[PDB]
Write a protein that binds this DNA or RNA. Structure first.
Lengths: 400, 409, 413, 400
DNA sequence: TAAGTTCCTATTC
DNA sequence: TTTAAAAGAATAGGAACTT
DNA sequence: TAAGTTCCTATTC
DNA sequence: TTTAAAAGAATAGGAACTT
DNA sequence: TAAGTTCCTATTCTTTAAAAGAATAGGAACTT
DNA sequence: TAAGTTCCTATTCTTTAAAAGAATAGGAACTT
């Protein structure tokens, strides 16, 4: 990819390659300065700070779409998300004195007559059909859990391979359960899996994601759930069909010191996943272009919590901005696991008289040792995922 | 109304009518550009976004009160709630180059300040009202006693059965739902449904979309033990008022709703009435709560019973415990008033702060069991006959239920 | 006072009197425009909003000290706490076109090395920070907060010239300590707001309300039984039987009298004599320092007491330091606060609960004994000057507690 | 030291010496204005307020590293932590009109950004992880404490250094204080203070703390193989009062408990005798280990409420107005804290109580036997440390 | 087969 | 999706001596 | 006869 | 001492008619 | 020697403002 | 009569932006 090449190219070389384009003013050469120009405009406006893959990608597109130049008057202009265009224009000139640069703001700073004619148009005959469907999804009959199962099911046969089937369901259920984004699941450090105690379910599986959108680390969980949908089961299926992925570098920094060497899922999994979700459209919402896809899980849990009147948890669970890395309260999992119910009147979690009590089953599992069969059931993750974890999951699975 | 005419006038025409005023500079013409100017300043600062009736009304008043101009120097100024006055001034000029505009922040001149002070000095903000409400509450009478007394103050003083019916309905409705006037008025009569409630069997639910914070909420009506029965007042309301055509409330032009539950002006006569029959001192205070009393009453009721956790949900308050973004684009489902809320307000149950439970009052009549007796009852479609004006508008399932409940008593 | 006259003068008249000063340009006339000018600069910069007595007093002084003018060039300048000097200058001119005004910031941009140096050079060779030094000592040395409180309280016992002043000083001091309030917090109490309020640790305590506080955030002022030689109820008793209700002083230009308290608890000038007294009978060094805390001592003491005991969470609430329903917002003090300050209990850091001292007398039970016999409206007889002002329920309670204290057979039947 | 000389030099003289450097523009003279310039820039930006040793040291280094000048154009520039460079530049000029000064923010141009990036291209989290490891492994806090304490037992070259290291370490742990918290103790403030659990404990006072918020330092009898009183005894009988080093350009205090340079020697020692891996890490905690240990101890025992008080962490409950203006008495460390750390008791998280460990020796009763000489055992501190204290310690020791 | 990927561009958060 | 950069004041470390 | 007051000015919050 | 100012969108009120 | 010292430099922690407004403390001449 | 209406004006609630950055969704053209 372009970004990968950028990261491979030495700084001095980049500035070199950029300058060369202007010695023998060629349309073929100046029109390919987009990547380089992006890098430069950033390095300038941020004094050397590294640039993230996504951000670079975005800006590079913006520059490409706006780049225009006059080889005769030695002038060149383009758009860039910045407000100190001057400082940037100047710095650019210093690198290529002969030329005159013009940075055009990406954001508009709105003529009446247009606004009017546009209004006049509307008068005669928001455009968020996406929000309309999302309301329906939740507004009609089915409960959140019913919708979850149905979506989860839509991949069951439509998938071409067991791996993809396994991945889609795992990813979807994972996103819902943690109210996380695709990346929150994908960037998990497989080596961070641990067994953590929870006074309601005994123990739950916890892993860590560092490379999140807002760069605020958060935990991702997996736990036993009462009913036809059991996260542990899908985690099991996931593990026995997929393998660790080398952490893709996503920023120009050269930092090779401390960092995760692996990641839980493949970066491109999202494309196929969305493409799948799009086709097997279990609900209308998924037919809408640019409508939520992999995100859906996020929106679902966010709604679930708001509906249950537990918005206090929303922030913690969904990892947002509020006023060690903050952990999810014990009762959250109690609820989502379905072994308990939230009582509005007293505000406590009440377990369902259903026979199986998660706590007692963990104890039965915790007891009988001498069964490192976990490392035998999950060969590809052996040596990667804590054995204590692999053994627990393995047991739980066999033990049922 | 002016706003209605604004909505009826085609955009190009508005800009037309505005420009004309400046070709033959007349005082009679420039002094009437307020409405148009309001619309324009908005459209400009919001890039075509529609403007809401109330907001337009407000701004239009502000412009009217501040509009001043010099026909000779071709200059014109006025106040407008904005901080990017320049952008606005410029855009205005482009439409009428000859003139120079000056937008003054709504954030004055001494002689005015003075005369105004001189005025105040001679004649003998909301603090008094809050104190009076606390009084109203801190004296023998319970929330329900106060509710009944107010409800009664209209019983005789009203000039017509309709007005009497409307006032009581509105008041009780506002209290019961902890809603504002508008929360009751903008209900979509076509959204009435029967919804189950584990404490009362079923309750009537309707929907309001056009709320102050634009966050939709539900409005309810349910059987209540005691002298005051919401269902009864709903019955009286329905048999004396008729569906109201939904007033247009924004310049836009479409998620329709042809009707609304009450008349927009009902609030004026209602407050005027509440003011005169002043059942309590609080109502004598100028600018003191009027139609808002209902809301304050229930808010107090819940707090006093120590259930402030519900207050937010019932009063439909923007919830701040969840990220802004978590709200704006990730939440897609109206929060639900918890079942027990109605149990309490219905008076068929009581709240035990210690056991955190709803203790049914041994009153003979059991809400749940009576609904079953009513639900069994079939064929009797006397609902559409009892509420002719709402027939075809309000779900027949609802009209039949109410009708039965009423007759069945 | 000048401020009172300002409030009595009709707006149009003020502007009148001000303008007149500039028609027959006289030094005797222009030099007396300070009050008027203060009022005007405020009304202008605040669009008619009223001005508070203290603020007016302050600004008027600042203007008086800086006012200067040229009758020939028809120019006049002065300092005023503002940053939009221009808007102000203009508005002034419009009122008197002939003249040119110049508002000078009270708080300029703000020095020069050589000065800084010579100043340092001065110091190298060789009362506000000395204030903080003494306050630390006061608390740092032996004595406990309660010991210091008693000692100060006593310093007035024999140095006062009248029983009333003695009574007032001790009441005020103890009141300020107990509520961690300022002089004004005690002075502006609405005598008509006294009420009996329940407290799970002491049975009941006396509560009153102050609205006119510095930060305009209302707060409650309390009085309660305390175990030991210092009993707030006793000093309240002495206070009430020697002082009378004070008509509420008007403290803002508003004409509004429509609704407001007609009485205030203490006299505005009490603070002068009180500080003067505290200054002389200087029970401790701290009080000798010029501009050092005087009536404010109470506030510092309690703040320190709470910090020392590690209960800073209460500090804000009790001291009313700034940080739904249709309600006059006033946050109250948690029940346990009074438990502590009353001395009938102790704070246990390990569990965070209040533990009563096995001392025989338990306050709750005594309130019950008092609550039982009523009908003895002996309160209105003991506090004649407050009768009809302070709730009878309150006067009767205090009265009983007092009698039921010194002893008497009828009060013990 | 330079700073000491600064404090010894009269203000007028400093400004004198500074000005002289610019009359006969000499590289040898202008290049030595760093100290003086530091002082001045401070005095200017703070209107005469004194400057602290550490702060002066830091700024002086920054100026030295950036100072550059042109004797011909009579210009001089340097970096300084400030944002009102102009005001400063001006003031400087007024003192030496002929010259033009340029203050550069300490906290651009492409070629620099580039070369800097080119540099990086070619070439904190670990320490925290290592501490967690150190903690999350069999050995209890007290076991770790003893082991570290022992690592000096033989590796030390003198009895004094051995004595000092162990004392300092145990002191830091016990009080959850920094090096300075122990070093700046006023030896004349030692007292006997009552404790409802241990009878009495030794209390001293530190005024010159980092946050300038005074705090108390304690020493008390502890059950087990590690007894603070014993190490205090060893300390006292091998070291002696240190003259309080002046730490600001300006409130006497004739002595301090330890030597300012003790920390270097101590860290160097801790580094070599590395009892644990953590100590091998460059820039990893050294003398700071004690605080971290206690901080962890309290958190682990679930008593974080105490942490703030014991560690003297700036309180954020009471407002700044409250804290600044109206607070004049050091928050008292709760009695039970010492009960715990002394090991004569245990904390019951459920009953919220101190459960005395049936150990035979009762701390309270032994104090009484003692309460029912010292100046001869601690000659160097005689007349300095309260006799009441020296006698108590002396007894306790002999009575052992 | 295309569902799956691959590597940008377009949109949304 | 988010929203505190920096001054101010310690605690490590480096290098060359010292006991 | 000085502690108390009155009504500003100076300082501090 | 305190420290979010203001745009945006309801709910009261005033005045002159209607019934 | 090499741990232990000096005396800076390099790193890693902790705390942060300014001024309009509105009290409280003090100065003098007067009251009692 | 005045309560009840109109149609603004006056008051009193309520919630906030904008944009640089960083992901997720979609378009075309290859792969198992």
């Amino acid at each position: 990819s372009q970004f990968d090449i950028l990261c491979k190219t030495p700084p001095k070389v980049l500035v070199r390659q950029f300058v060369e384009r202007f010695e023998r003013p060629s349309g073929e050469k100046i029109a390919s300065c987009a990547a380089e120009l992006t890098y430069l405009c950033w390095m300038i406006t941020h004094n050397g700070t590294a640039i993230k893959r996504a951000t670079f990608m975005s800006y590079n597109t913006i520059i490409s779409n706006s780049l225009s130049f006059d080889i005769v008057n030695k002038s060149l202009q383009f758009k860039y998300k910045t407000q100190k265009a001057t400082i940037l224009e100047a710095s650019l000139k210093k690198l290529i004195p002969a030329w005159e640069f013009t940075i055009i703001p990406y954001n508009g700073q709105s003529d009446i007559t247009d606004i009017v004619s546009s209004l006049q148009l509307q008068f005669e005959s928001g455009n968020s059909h996406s929000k309309k469907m999302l309301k329906a999804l939740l507004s009609e009959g089915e409960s959140i859990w019913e919708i979850t199962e149905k979506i989860l099911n839509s991949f069951e046969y439509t998938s071409r391979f067991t791996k993809t089937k396994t991945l889609y369901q795992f990813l979807f259920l994972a996103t819902f359960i943690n109210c996380g984004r695709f990346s929150d699941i994908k960037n998990v450090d497989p080596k961070s899996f641990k067994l953590v105690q929870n006074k309601y379910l005994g123990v739950i599986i916890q892993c860590l994601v560092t490379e999140t959108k807002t760069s605020v680390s958060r935990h991702i969980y997996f736990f036993s759930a009462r009913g036809r949908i059991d996260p542990l089961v899908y985690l099991d299926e996931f593990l026995r069909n997929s393998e660790p992925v080398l952490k893709r570098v996503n920023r120009t920094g050269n930092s090779s010191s401390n960092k995760q060497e692996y990641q839980l899922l493949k970066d491109n999994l999202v494309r196929s996943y969305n493409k799948a979700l799009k086709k097997n459209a279990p609900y209308p919402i998924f037919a809408i272009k640019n409508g939520p896809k992999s995100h859906i899980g996020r929106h679902l849990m966010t709604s679930f919590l708001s509906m249950k009147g537990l918005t206090e948890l929303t922030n913690v669970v969904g990892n947002f901005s509020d006023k060690q890395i903050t952990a999810i309260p014990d009762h959250y999992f109690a609820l989502v696991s379905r072994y308990y119910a939230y009582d509005p009147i007293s505000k406590e979690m009440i377990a369902l008289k259903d026979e199986t009590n998660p706590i007692e089953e963990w104890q039965h599992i915790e007891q009988l040792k001498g069964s490192a069969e976990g490392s035998i059931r999950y060969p590809a993750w052996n040596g990667i995922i804590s054995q204590e974890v692999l053994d627990y999951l393995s047991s739980y699975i066999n033990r049922r």
